[PDB]
Ligand binder design. Structure first.
Ligand SMILES: CCCCCCCCCCCCCCCCCC(=O)OC[C@H](COP(=O)([O-])OCC(O)COP(=O)([O-])OC[C@@H](COC(=O)CCCCCCCCCCCCCCCCC)OC(=O)CCCCCCCCCCCCCCCCC)OC(=O)CCCCCCCCCCCCCCCCC
Ligand SMILES: CCCCCCCCCCCCCCCCCC(=O)OC[C@H](COP(=O)([O-])OCC(O)COP(=O)([O-])OC[C@@H](COC(=O)CCCCCCCCCCCCCCCCC)OC(=O)CCCCCCCCCCCCCCCCC)OC(=O)CCCCCCCCCCCCCCCCC
Ligand SMILES: CC(C)=CCC/C(C)=C/CC/C(C)=C\CC/C(C)=C/CC/C(C)=C/CC/C(C)=C/CC/C(C)=C/CC/C(C)=C/CC/C(C)=C/CC1=C(C)C(=O)c2ccccc2C1=O
Ligand SMILES: CC(C)=CCC/C(C)=C/CC/C(C)=C\CC/C(C)=C/CC/C(C)=C/CC/C(C)=C/CC/C(C)=C\CC/C(C)=C/CC/C(C)=C/CC1=C(C)C(=O)c2ccccc2C1=O
Ligand SMILES: CCCCCCCCCCCCCCCC(=O)O[C@H](COC(=O)CCCCCCC[C@@H](C)CCCCCCCCC)COP(=O)(O)O[C@H]1[C@H](O)[C@H](O)[C@H](O)[C@@H](O)[C@@H]1O
Ligand SMILES: CCCCCCCCCCCCCCCC(=O)O[C@H](COC(=O)CCCCCCC[C@@H](C)CCCCCCCCC)COP(=O)(O)O[C@H]1[C@H](O)[C@H](O)[C@H](O)[C@@H](O)[C@@H]1O
Ligand SMILES: CCCCCCCCCCCCCCCC(=O)O[C@H](COC(=O)CCCCCCC[C@@H](C)CCCCCCCCC)COP(=O)(O)O[C@H]1[C@H](O)[C@H](O)[C@H](O)[C@@H](O)[C@@H]1O
Ligand code: HEC
Ligand code: HEC
Ligand SMILES: *C[C@@H](COC(=O)CCCCCCCCCCCCCCC)OC(=O)CCCCCCCC[C@@H](C)CCCCCCCC
Ligand SMILES: *C(=O)CCCCCCCCCCCCCCC
Ligand code: FES
Ligand SMILES: [Cu+2]
Lengths: 147, 223, 157, 312, 139, 115, 219, 92
C-alpha cells in the first residue's frame, strides 16, 4: 500500500535550509537568509544577504521590488530566466551575480521565520524565509567554570 | 573546471530531468528540489547508487552505482554550481578522501554513534526498521566518505547532522567507529546478525533445540 | 561533555539530543562536577530531542493548549522519553516528521505536537519550551507542562 | 470504407506507412476471408443438432479423410506463403538504408523522457551544411594502472575493458531538444525529406513509436553492442502538422508520461527553425519564431502530480 | 516400446535442422554475427531430445515387444505385479517449505536464510528419499 | 485486472497510482500465465491422464505432491511482493533486463518475483 | 558447541546503559518476547478515571496475569469442562484428543504470533515489510490466527485419527499388483492383525498406539 | 509382519453419552473431543467484535480499517453461515 499513491518519497522536501515557493509561476527554491549571527539577534543596520534560485516554468524575469521588511536592494542583471535559473549569489560554498541583500532595521535571529514577499510580473508570494548558514563550525563557546 | 560542469550537465540531462526539471528545481509530487543539497549530497546519493532511481516508494533503497568516481565529481560540482551547500571532503590529491576520514578515536565515536543515531540503525550499524515501509540500511557496505556525506546531508528520513551539529572531528570520529564496528569480527563465535536476542532465539531452536530433540529421539525409542 | 547550544548548530530537518545543563555544573574537570553532570546523563526524564522543522513545513503544524508559544520559530523541543513504558523515542524521521520509538515502534507526529500517529501509545509525548538566552544560546523556557515520563496512576487532572 | 475496414489505423504520413497500411488492409481482407468461411462452418455445423426424429442410430462416424486433409494442409500453406512474400517485399521497404539522407535526428531516450538530436542535415535542395558536435563523448574506460591490491593486475574494466556506466554510444549534439517533465519534447521535421532516425537510450529499453509513422523501433541501451540496427530512415513525410508519439515498451513507473511530438513543418519553416536556434533559443521560442504554437498541441504535459486523490 | 524413440528422433531431426539453419542463417544475414543465444539453445535442445531419444532407443533395442505396447494385446497378457508406488507421504510439503525458505533467502538477500533453507532442503530430501528404507527401531 | 480496468476507465490517475498499476499488470500477467495456466496444464494431467492411459497412479506419486506444493509455495512467495512496501515487480511480465538489473526496479518485490 | 561457535549477548558491541540512547531492536530474550510483543500489539487503549490514568501497561500486566492463570490452572479447567474424574496413568496421543490439541495449538500459534511480532522491528527490516503493516498483521493475527489454527488443528487431529483408523479396517499400503483375469489395480494392503479367508482381514480395535503405516517399518 | 496387537483398557468416559459419536470423530472415548459449539460461535463473533473495537486508537491510516472491516465481515459471515446451517440442519 506504501508503493505509489501517497508516497513517502515524492511527497517530500529537500534536506536544505531555505523554503521553496511553487506559486506565482516562478519556481522559487531554497530561499534563505545568509546572516552571520553574532549575538541574540542580529542588530539593525547589519547587511545580510538573501539567496534563492528563480527557475522559470514556461518568460518571467522582472523582479520588481521583493520587499517586506529590511530595504531589499537588487542588481540590474536580473532579467535572466527564459525557461532558466536566476542564481542570486553564492549561497554556501558555491565556487565558480545579483547581490540581493537587506538592511535590517529590525532585530532578527536564527531559528525564526520572517515573512518576505517576493513580487514578480505574474504575482507575489509570502515565503516565511529562514536564517541559514553553511558556515564554518560553531564559534567557540567559553568553557564554564565548575561550580 | 567548466568542462567538468558541462560533463555534469550532460549526465544530468539524460538521467533525472523527468524528476528534477532541468533547472535543478523540483518536479512537484514526482521528485523534490535539488539546489542547496550540494556535492556532498550528490556524492552520497549517486556513489551509493540510490538516487538514479526508478520509483517513488516507501523509501528508495540501495542499489549498484549508476555513475563512477570520474563522473560523481562532475555531477556534484554541477549541482553545487547551480545550488551550493555541503561539499565532500577531499585529500591532497583532489580526489574524494576516504581513508583520511577515519578519526583517531573510536570510543568517543562509539558513544556518539550510540547516542546520536544508533537508535535508528543498531549498535554495530546493522539496519533498523522505520515507520511506514522505510527502514535503516546496514552500514557494512558503506564507503567512509559515503558515511560522512550520509550524516552530513541526510537523504531520506534521517536528520542532516550538519557541520555545526556534529563537528568534523566528531564526524570523522563516528566514521572511525562504524568502519571498525562493521569491520571487526564478532569476538567469540558466529555473529548472529548484530542485534542480539531474536537471531539467538531462532538459532537456539533450529540449531540447538532441533539438535537436542534429535539426540533425544535417537536415544529414546518411540511407542 | 556538555557543550552549550545555539540555533545555528541544528539545521533544517534535524533531530538533536539536548540535556539540561546549567551554568553552575560546568565542565567535567572537578569532582563536585561529574556527579551533578553524570546525574544529567543518568536521569531518565532528562533527554529532549531538539527538532528543527524545515520551514516549508511550518504550515502543517497545529499546536495544542497552553503550548502555542513553546516553539522557537521552527525549533521544537519534544522529550525523548516516550509516552508509555518510558523508552527513549530517539528515532526521528524528517520529511515525514515522525518521532518513532524503537522499543515498541510507536510513531509520534513531529508536526502538530507529539500525538501518537500510530503505535501502542495513546498520549502526547511532552514538549519543552524554548527561548534563546542573552548571548544567543538555546535555553528552556520553564518546565514541561505535564509529567514527562511514562504514565502511572496519579496523572492528568 | 478504407479506414473502418483497416481496423482503425491512423492513416499514413510516410510512404513507408502508406505501403504498410495497404498491406494491413490486404491482410485483414485475408483474415476476414478465412474467418468468415470458418465461422460459416461453425454456425452452419450448428445446424446439425440432435434431431428429435433421430433414433438410436449414430452419425456417419467417419474421421480420417486423407484427400481433404491434403487440400487443407496445402491451402493454408499457400495463404501463408503469399502473405510471407508480400511481408518480405514490404520488409525490403522498411529501411532502404540510403547513405545520403536529408536530416539525421539523434533520438536519445533517457529515463522517462526523450531528447532529440539534429545530428546532421543535408538538403538535396541545397542548404544546411550542419553537423554534430562531439566534444561531449568522454568515456568511463577505467584504465587505472593499479587497483586495491598493490601490483600486477592493472585492472581495465568489466565489459570490453570498460565499466557499464560508460556512455560512449551516447552521441550528443549542439542542438538538443530536451524534454522536461512539464514540457513535452517537440521534434520538428521538414515535410518531404529523407529523415533518418538514430536511436539510443541512456538507461533502459523503450520504444520510439509514433502512431502515425506506422512503425517503431526499440531504443536499446547500447544497440551497436547488442546487434541492434537502431537506425532507420523515414522515406518522406507528406502531411504537415503535429503528430503524437508514444512510448511502447516498459521503462518503469512514469511510462505513459513519455509522450513526444514530431511536428512536420515546411522546409522554409525548418530553415527558420534551426537558423532561429543556432542563435541559441529554447524550444518554445524557436517554435514561436516560425508562426506555430509553441507548446505541445496534441498532448498536454500532464500531471506532475500522482493522482486525482493526492492532496495537490 | 518403439515409438518414443521415433518421436524424439523426429524432434531431434527438426531441432538439429533448426539449430544448424539458425546458425548458418545468422552467420550471414544478421547485423553483427551469430546470435549465440538462441543458437546454443537450439543446439542443446537438440541435445535434450538426443538424450531422451537415445536412451529410449537404447531401451527399445534391449527389449522385446512389451506386452503393454503390443497392438492386439489382451489385458491378461500383461496383468502381473507392478512396482512400488508411494502411499501417503508428508515429505513433499516439507520439500516445498524448505525450497521456499531457500528461495526467499535468495530473494531477500539473506545468506543465513540461504544456508538454513539449503540445510532444510537436505534434511527434507533425506526424509523423502529414506522414507521407505528406514528399518524398525533396534532398541 | 478489475483494478487495472477501473484505472483505465478514465484518463486521470483516479483510483490507484502509477507504480501500483505497474505492479498490477505484472503480478496479474504472472498469476494468469505462470501461476494459473502453467499449473492447470498439469492440473488436468493429474486429474485424468492416469485415468486415460490406464495407469493406477501417476508415475512418481510423491513427486506430483512435490510439484503441486512447490507450485503453491512459489506462487505465494511471488504474490508476496504485495506485502512489501514498495510493492511487487513494476517491470512487466516480459521483464526486460535493463529494467530488471538492480539499478533498475531495486525493490524487494522483483526479487521475490524472481525466486 | 553453540557457546563457542555462536556469539550471544555481545555486550561490548552494546553500550553501557545510559537512558538517552537505544538500539532499534530493543527486543527481549525469546521466552519473554511474547510479553512486550503483547505490548507491541495491544492497540493503545488507555482509560482516564476521575483525575487518574490507567495506561496501556496495565493490560499486559493483566494479560501476563491472565495467561499464567490459564497456564497454571489448566488441568482444573478441563477437569471441570470434560469430566475427567479418573486416575489417568496412560497417556493419550495428541491426535486422540482433538479439541485439547486444538486449544493447545491455539496457544502455540498465539505464542508464535506474539513472538514473531516482537521481532516486528527486524522482520520488517530484513523481510522487507512496512513496520506498521507487520504490527497490524500481528494485531489482527492474535485475534484471527488462533481461530484458523484451531480449525486446522481440530480437523487435522480428527483426520490424523481417521488416517490410523483406516490402517486397521484396511491393511498397510505397499506396491501395486494387478488382478489377473481382468484389469484392476489393488494396492496390496498388508494386514496388521488376523486375516479372514478372503481379501479383507479381521479389523482390529484402536488402542492408543502409534500404528505403523509403512511396511518399511515392519520387518 | 513383525508386530503384535495392541490392547489398552483405559478409564473410559459426561460418561460416553453426550458429546460426539464415535463415527463423527473416530476416537471420542479416548479423550476430550467436542467443544460445545456455542463457545466457538460466540468466540468467533467476539473475535470479530474485538476487530471492530480495534478501530479505536491512535490512528490516521484508514487503509487499515478496511482490513478490520474485511476480517470482521469474513468472521461474521462464517459464524452466521455456520449458525444458519445448524438452525436449518445443514441445508444450502
Ligand atoms: C535442480 C533442482 C534439483 C531437483 C532434484 C530432483 C529432481 C529429480 C526428478 C526426476 C528424477 C527421478 C525421480 O523421480 O526421483 C524420485 C523421487 C520421487 O519419489 P516418488 O515420487 O515417491 O517415487 C518413488 C521413487 O521413484 C523410487 O525411486 P528412488 O527413491 O530410488 O529415487 C532415485 C533417486 C533419484 O535420483 C535423482 O533424481 C538424481 C539426483 C540429482 C539431485 C541432486 C541436486 C542437483 C541440483 C543442485 C543445484 C540446485 O533418489 C536418490 O537416491 C537421490 C536423490 C538425491 C536428491 C538430492 C537433492 C538435494 C538438492 C540440494 C543440493 C545442495 C546444493 C545446492 C546449494 O524424487 C527424489 O528422490 C528427489 C527429491 C526431490 C528434490 C527436489 C528439490 C527441491
Ligand atoms: C443469516 C445469517 C447471517 C449471514 C450469513 C451469510 C450466509 C452465507 C454467506 C457465505 C459466507 C461467506 C464465506 C464463505 C466461505 C465458506 C466456504 C467453505 O468453508 O467451504 C465449505 C467446506 C466447509 O464446510 P462448511 O459448510 O463450512 O460446514 C462445516 C461445519 O458445519 C462447520 O464446522 P464446525 O462446526 O467444526 O465449526 C468450526 C469453527 C466454528 O465455525 C465458525 O463459526 C467460525 C469461527 C471463526 C472462523 C475464523 C476462521 C477459521 C475458518 C477456517 C478458515 C481457514 C482459512 O470453529 C473454529 O474452528 C474456530 C473457533 C474460534 C475460537 C475463538 C477465537 C479466540 C482466539 C483467542 C482470543 C485472543 C484475543 C486476545 C489475545 C490476548 C492473549 C491473552 O469446506 C470444505 O469442506 C473444503 C474447503 C476447500 C477450500 C476451497 C476454497 C479455495 C482455497 C484456496 C487456497
Ligand atoms: C471455579 C472453578 C470452575 C475453577 C475453574 C476456573 C478458574 C481456574 C479460573 C481462573 C481465574 C481466572 C483466569 C482469573 C484470574 C486472573 C486474574 C485477573 C489475576 C491477574 C493479576 C492482576 C490482577 C495483577 C497484576 C500484577 C501482574 C501480574 C504483575 C506485575 C508485573 C511485575 C511485578 C513485573 O515485575 C513485570 C515485569 C515484566 C513484565 C511485566 C511485569 C508485570 O506485569
Ligand atoms: C502447550 C500450550 C502452550 C497449551 C498451554 C495451555 C494454554 C491454554 C495456556 C494459555 C495460553 C494462551 C492463552 C496464550 C499463549 C501464551 C504462551 C502459551 C506463553 C507461555 C509460554 C510457553 C508455554 C509457550 C508455548 C510452548 C512452545 C511454543 C512449544 C514449542 C513448539 C513445539 C511444540 C516444540 C518443537 C519445536 C522445535 C522442534 C523447534 C522447531 C523450530 C520452530 C521454527 C521453532 C519456532 C520458534 C519458537 C517456538 C520460538 O519461541 C522462537 C523464538 C525466537 C525466535 C524464533 C522462534 C521460533 O522460530
Ligand atoms: C571450524 C574451526 C573453528 C573456526 C570457528 C568457527 C566459528 C565461526 C566464527 C569465526 C569467524 C566468522 C564470523 C565472521 C563475523 C560475523 O559476524 O559473521 C558474519 C555474518 O554475516 C553473515 O550473515 C554472512 C555469513 C553467511 C554464512 C552462512 C550463515 C550462517 C547460518 C548457517 C546461521 C544459521 C542461523 C539460523 C537460521 C534460522 C533458520 C530460519 C528458518 C560474516 O562476516 P562477513 O560476511 O564477512 O561480513 C559481515 C556481514 O555479514 C554483515 O552483514 C555486516 O553487517 C558486518 O557484520 C560484516 O562484518
Ligand atoms: C493499604 C491499601 C492498599 C493501597 C496501597 C497504596 C495506597 C497508599 C495510600 C496512602 C496515601 C493516601 C493519600 C495521601 C497521598 C497523596 O497525597 O497522594 C496520593 C498518593 O496515593 C497513591 O499513590 C495511590 C492512591 C491515590 C489516592 C486515591 C486513589 C484511590 C481512589 C481515588 C481510586 C478509585 C476510584 C477512581 C477509579 C477507580 C478505577 C477505575 C474506575 C494520590 O496521589 P496524587 O493524587 O497524585 O497527589 C500528588 C501528591 O502526592 C504530591 O505531593 C503533590 O505534588 C500533588 O501535586 C500530586 O502529585
Ligand atoms: C511464515 C509465513 C507467514 C505468512 C504470512 C503472510 C501475511 C498475510 C497477508 C499480509 C498482508 C499484508 C498487507 C500489508 C500492506 C500494507 O502496507 O498496508 C499497511 C497495513 O496493512 C495491513 O497490515 C493489513 C493486513 C493484515 C493482514 C491480516 C493478518 C492475517 C494473519 C492470519 C496473518 C498472520 C501471519 C503471522 C505468521 C506468524 C507465524 C504463525 C505460525 C498500511 O500501513 P502503511 O503502509 O504503513 O501506511 C500507509 C502508507 O505507507 C501509504 O504510503 C499510504 O498510501 C497509506 O496507505 C498509509 O496507510
Ligand atoms: C526516481 C527519479 C529520479 C532519478 C532518476 C534521479 N532523481 Fe534524485 N530524487 C528523486 C526522488 C524521488 C528523490 C526523493 C528522495 C529524497 O528526496 O529524500 C530525490 C532526491 C535526490 C537527492 C537528495 C536530496 C536531499 O535533500 O537529500 C539528491 C542528492 C538527488 N536526488 C540527486 C540526483 C542525481 C544527482 C541524479 C542523477 C542525475 C538523480 N537524483 C536521479 C528523483 C530522481
Ligand atoms: C531515521 C533516523 C536515522 C538516523 C538518525 C540516521 N540514519 Fe542513516 N540512514 C537512515 C535511512 C532511512 C537511510 C537510507 C536513506 C536512503 O536510502 O536514501 C540511511 C542511510 C545511511 C547510510 C548508507 C548505507 C548504505 O548502504 O550506503 C549510512 C552509512 C548511514 N545512514 C549511517 C548513518 C550515520 C553515520 C548517522 C549519523 C551518526 C545516521 N545513519 C543516522 C536512517 C537514519
Ligand atoms: C494498499 C493495499 C490495499 O488495501 C486497501 O486499499 C483496502 C483494503 C482491502 C480490504 C481487505 C479485505 C480482505 C478480507 C480477507 C479475506 C481473505 C480470505 C479469507 C481469510 C481468512 O494493498 C494490499 O494490502 C493488498 C494485500 C496483499 C495480499 C497478499 C496476498 C497473500 C500473500 C501470501 C504471502 C500470504 C500467505 C498465505 C495466504 C493464504 C494462502 C492459501 C493457500
Ligand atoms: C502496497 O505498497 C502494495 C501496492 C500494490 C497493491 C495492489 C493490490 C492489488 C490486489 C492484490 C490481491 C492479492 C490477493 C488478495 C486476496 C483477496
Ligand atoms: S516504549 Fe517507546 S512507546 Fe512503548
Ligand atoms: Cu518508456
Amino acid at each position: 500500500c506504501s508503493a505509489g499513491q501517497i508516497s513517502q518519497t515524492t511527497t517530500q522536501e529537500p534536506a536544505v535550509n531555505g523554503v521553496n515557493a511553487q506559486a506565482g509561476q516562478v519556481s522559487l527554491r531554497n530561499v534563505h537568509l545568509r546572516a552571520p549571527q553574532q549575538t541574540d539577534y542580529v542588530e539593525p543596520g547589519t547587511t545580510v544577504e538573501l539567496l534563492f534560485v528563480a527557475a522559470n516554468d514556461s518568460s518571467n524575469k522582472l523582479k520588481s521590488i521583493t520587499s517586506d521588511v529590511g530595504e531589499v536592494t537588487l542588481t540590474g542583471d536580473s532579467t535572466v530566466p527564459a525557461d532558466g535559473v536566476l542564481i542570486v549569489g553564492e549561497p554556501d560554498g558555491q565556487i565558480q551575480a545579483v547581490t540581493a541583500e537587506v538592511e535590517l532595521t529590525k532585530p532578527i535571529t536564527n531559528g525564526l521565520l520572517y515573512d518576505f514577499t517576493f513580487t514578480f510580473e505574474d504575482g507575489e508570494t509570502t515565503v516565511a524565509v529562514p536564517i541559514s548558514a553553511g558556515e564554518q563550525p560553531r564559534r567557540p563557546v567559553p568553557p564554564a567554570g565548575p561550580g | 573546471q567548466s568542462a567538468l560542469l558541462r560533463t555534469g550537465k550532460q549526465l544530468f540531462e539524460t538521467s533525472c530531468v523527468s524528476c528534477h526539471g532541468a533547472n535543478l528545481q523540483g518536479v512537484p509530487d514526482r521528485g523534490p528540489s535539488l539546489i542547496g543539497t550540494g556535492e556532498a549530497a550528490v556524492y552520497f546519493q549517486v556513489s551509493t547508487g540510490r538516487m538514479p532511481a526508478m520509483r517513488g516508494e516507501a523509501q528508495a533503497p540501495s542499489k549498484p552505482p549508476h555513475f563512477d568516481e570520474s563522473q560523481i565529481d562532475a555531477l556534484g560540482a554541477y549541482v553545487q554550481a547551480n545550488g551550493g551547500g555541503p561539499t565532500v571532503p577531499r585529500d591532497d590529491h583532489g580526489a574524494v578522501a576516504q581513508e583520511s576520514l577515519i578519526g583517531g578515536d573510536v570510543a568517543r565515536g562509539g558513544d556518539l554513534f550510540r547516542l546520536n543515531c544508533a537508535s535508528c540503525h543498531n549498535f554495530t550499524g546493522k539496519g533498523g526498521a522505520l515507520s511506514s515501509g522505510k527502514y535503516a540500511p546496514d552500514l557494512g557496505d558503506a564507503n567512509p566518505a559515503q558515511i560522512y556525506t550520509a550524516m552530513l546531508t541526510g537523504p531520506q528520513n534521517m536528520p542532516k547532522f550538519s557541520d555545526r551539529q556534529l563537528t568534523p572531528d566528531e564526524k570523522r570520529d563516528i566514521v572511525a567507529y562504524v568502519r571498525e564496528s562493521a569491520e571487526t569480527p564478532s569476538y567469540g563465535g558466529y555473529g548472529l546478525g548484530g542485534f542480539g536476542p531474536a537471531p539467538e532465539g531462532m538459532a537456539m531452536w533450529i540449531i540447538g533445540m532441533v539438535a537436542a530433540i534429535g539426540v533425544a529421539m535417537w536415544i529414546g525409542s518411540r511407542a | 561533555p556538555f557543550v552549550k547550544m545555539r540555533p545555528e548548530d541544528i539545521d533544517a530537518g534535524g533531530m538533536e539530543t539536548v540535556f539540561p545543563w546549567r551554568e553552575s555544573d560546568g565542565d567535567g574537570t572537578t569532582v563536585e562536577s561529574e556527579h551533578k553532570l553524570t546525574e544529567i546523563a543518568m536521569g531518565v526524564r532528562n533527554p529532549v530531542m531538539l527538532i528543527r522543522i524545515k520551514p516549508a513545513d511550518m504550515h502543517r503544524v497545529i499546536k495544542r493548549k497552553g503550548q502555542e508559544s513553546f516553539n522557537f520559530g521552527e525549533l521544537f523541543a519534544y522529550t525523548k522519553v516516550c509516552s508509555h513504558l518510558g523508552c527513549p523515542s530517539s528515532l526521528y524521521e524528517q520529511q515525514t516528521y515522525r518521532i518513532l520509538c524503537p522499543c515498541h515502534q510507536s510513531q509520534f507526529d513531529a508536526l502538530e505536537f507529539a500525538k501518537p500517529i500510530f503505535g501502542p501509545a495513546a498520549r502526547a509525548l511532552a514538549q519543552l519550551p524554548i527561548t534563546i538566552d542573552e548571548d544567543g544560546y538555546l535555553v528552556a523556557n520553564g518546565d514541561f507542562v505535564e509529567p514527562v515520563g511514562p504514565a502511572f496512576w496519579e496523572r492528568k487532572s | 470504407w478504407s479506414d473502418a475496414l483497416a481496423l482503425g489505423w491512423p492513416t499514413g504520413i510516410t510512404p513507408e506507412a502508406k505501403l504498410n497500411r495497404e498491406l494491413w488492409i490486404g491482410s485483414v481482407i485475408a483474415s476476414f476471408a478465412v474467418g468468415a468461411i470458418v465461422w460459416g462452418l461453425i454456425f452452419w455445423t450448428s445446424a446439425f443438432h440432435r434431431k428429435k426424429a433421430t433414433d438410436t442410430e449414430l452419425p456417419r462416424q467417419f474421421g480420417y479423410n486423407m484427400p481433404l486433409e491434403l487440400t487443407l494442409t496445402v491451402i493454408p500453406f499457400l495463404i501463408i506463403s503469399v502473405l510471407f512474400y508480400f511481408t518480405v517485399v514490404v520488409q525490403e521497404r522498411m529501411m532502404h538504408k540510403d547513405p545520403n539522407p536529408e536530416v539525421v535526428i539523434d533520438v536519445t531516450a533517457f529515463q522517462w523522457n526523450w531528447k532529440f538530436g539534429y545530428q546532421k542535415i543535408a538538403f538535396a535542395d541545397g542548404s544546411f551544411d550542419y553537423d554534430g558536435a562531439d566534444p561531449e563523448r568522454k568515456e568511463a574506460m577505467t584504465s587505472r594502472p593499479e587497483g586495491k591490491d598493490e601490483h600486477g593486475i592493472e585492472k581495465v574494466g568489466p565489459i570490453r575493458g570498460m565499466t557499464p556506466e560508460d556512455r560512449t554510444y551516447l552521441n550528443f549534439d549542439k542542438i538538443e531538444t530536451l524534454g522536461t517533465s512539464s514540457e513535452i519534447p517537440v521534434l520538428v521535421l521538414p515535410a518531404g525529406k529523407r529523415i533518418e532516425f538514430v536511436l539510443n537510450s541512456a538507461d533502459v529499453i523503450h520504444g520510439f513509436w509514433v502512431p502515425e509513422f506506422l512503425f517503431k523501433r526499440d531504443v536499446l541501451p547500447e544497440p551497436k553492442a547488442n546487434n541492434s540496427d537502431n537506425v532507420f530512415q523515414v522515406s518522406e513525410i507528406q502531411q504537415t502538422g503535429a503528430f503524437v508519439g508514444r512510448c511502447t515498451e516498459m521503462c518503469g513507473t512514469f511510462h505513459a508520461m513519455m509522450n513526444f511530438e514530431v511536428r512536420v513543418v515546411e522546409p522554409n519553416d525548418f530553415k527558420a527553425y534551426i537558423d532561429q536556434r543556432n542563435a541559441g533559443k529554447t524550444n518554445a521560442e524557436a517554435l514561436a519564431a516560425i508562426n506555430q504554437p509553441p507548446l505541445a498541441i496534441t498532448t498536454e504535459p500532464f500531471e506532475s502530480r500522482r493522482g486525482e486523490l493526492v492532496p495537490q | 516400446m518403439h515409438i518414443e524413440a521415433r518421436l524424439f528422433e523426429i524432434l531431434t531431426a527438426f531441432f538439429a535442422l533448426a539449430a544448424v539453419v539458425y546458425a548458418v542463417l545468422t552467420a550471414m544475414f544478421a547485423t553483427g554475427g551469430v546470435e549465440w543465444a538462441g543458437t546454443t539453445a537450439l543446439v542443446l535442445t537438440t541435445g535434450l531430445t538426443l538424450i531422451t531419444g537415445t536412451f529410449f532407443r537404447f531401451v527399445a533395442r534391449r527389449l522385446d515387444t512389451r506386452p503393454e505396447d503390443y497392438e492386439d494385446a489382451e489385458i491378461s497378457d500383461g496383468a502381473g505385479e507392478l512396482g512400488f508406488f508411494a502411499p501417503h507421504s508428508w515429505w513433499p510439503i516439507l520439500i516445498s517449505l524448505s525450497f521456499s525458505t531457500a528461495a526467499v533467502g535468495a530473494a531477500l538477500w539473506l545468506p543465513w536464510l540461504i544456508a538454513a533453507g539449503v540445510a532444510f532442503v537436505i534434511t527434507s530430501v533425506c526424509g523423502l528419499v529414506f522414507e521407505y528404507y528406514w528399518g524398525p527401531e533396534k532398541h | 485486472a478489475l483494478f487495472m480496468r477501473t484505472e483505465l476507465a478514465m484518463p486521470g490517475l483516479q483510483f490507484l497510482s502509477n507504480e501500483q498499476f505497474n505492479q498490477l499488470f505484472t503480478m496479474h500477467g504472472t498469476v494468469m500465465l505462470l501461476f494459473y495456466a502453467t499449473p492447470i496444464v498439469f492440473g488436468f494431467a493429474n486429474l485424468v491422464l492416469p485415468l486415460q492411459i490406464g495407469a493406477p497412479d501417476v508415475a512418481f506419486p510423491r513427486l506430483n505432491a512435490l510439484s503441486f506444493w512447490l507450485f503453491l509455495f512459489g506462487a505465494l512467495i511471488a504474490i508476496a511482493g504485495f506485502i512489501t512496501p514498495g510493492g511487487a515487480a513494476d517491470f512487466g511480465w516480459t521483464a526486460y533486463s535493463p529494467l530488471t538489473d538492480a539499478i533498475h526496479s531495486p525493490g524487494a518485490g522483483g526479487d521475490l518475483w524472481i525466486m | 558447541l553453540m557457546g563457542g561457535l555462536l556469539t550471544i549477548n555481545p555486550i561490548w558491541n552494546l553500550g553501557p546503559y545510559k537512558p538517552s540512547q537505544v538500539s532499534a531492536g530493543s527486543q527481549p530474550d525469546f521466552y519473554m518476547m511474547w510479553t512486550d510483543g503483547l505490548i507491541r500489539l495491544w492497540p493503545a487503549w488507555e482509560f482516564y478515571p476521575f483525575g487518574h490514568t490507567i495506561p496501556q501497561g496495565v493490560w499486559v500486566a493483566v494479560g501476563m496475569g491472565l495467561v499464567f492463570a490459564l497456564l497454571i490452572a489448566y488441568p482444573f479447567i478441563e477437569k471441570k469442562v470434560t469430566g475427567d474424574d479418573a486416575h489417568h496413568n496412560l497417556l493419550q496421543r495428541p491426535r486422540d484428543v482433538p479439541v485439547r490439541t486444538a486449544i493447545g495449538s491455539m496457544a502455540i500459534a498465539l505464542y508464535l504470533l506474539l513472538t514473531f511480532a516482537c521481532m516486528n522491528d527486524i522482520i520488517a527490516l530484513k523481510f522487507h515489510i512496512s513496520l506498521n503493516a507487520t504490527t497490524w498483521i500481528g494485531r489482527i493475527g492474535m485475534v484471527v490466527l488462533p481461530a484458523i489454527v484451531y480449525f486446522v488443528a481440530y480437523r487435522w487431529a480428527i483426520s490424523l485419527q481417521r488416517s490410523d483408523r483406516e490402517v486397521l479396517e484396511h491393511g498397510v499400503e505397499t506396491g501395486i499388483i494387478k488382478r489377473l483375469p481382468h484389469g484392476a489395480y489393488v494396492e496390496l494392503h498388508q494386514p496388521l492383525g488376523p486375516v479372514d479367508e478372503h481379501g479383507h482381514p479381521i479389523p482390529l480395535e484402536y488402542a492408543g498406539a502409534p500404528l505403523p503405516k509403512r511396511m518399511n517399518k515392519l520387518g | 509382519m513383525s508386530s503384535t496387537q495392541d490392547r489398552s483398557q483405559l478409564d473410559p468416559e459426561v460418561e460416553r453419552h453426550t458429546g460426539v459419536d464415535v463415527e463423527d470423530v473416530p476416537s471420542a472415548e479416548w479423550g476430550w473431543s467436542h467443544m460445545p459449539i456455542g463457545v466457538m460461535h460466540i468466540g468467533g463473533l467476539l473475535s470479530a467484535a474485538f476487530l471492530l473495537v480495534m478501530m479505536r486508537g491512535n490512528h490516521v491510516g484508514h487503509v487499515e480499517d478496511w482490513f478490520l472491516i474485511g476480517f470482521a465481515a469474513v468472521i461474521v459471515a462464517l459464524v452466521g453461515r455456520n449458525w444458519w446451517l445448524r438452525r436449518r440442519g445443514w441445508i444450502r
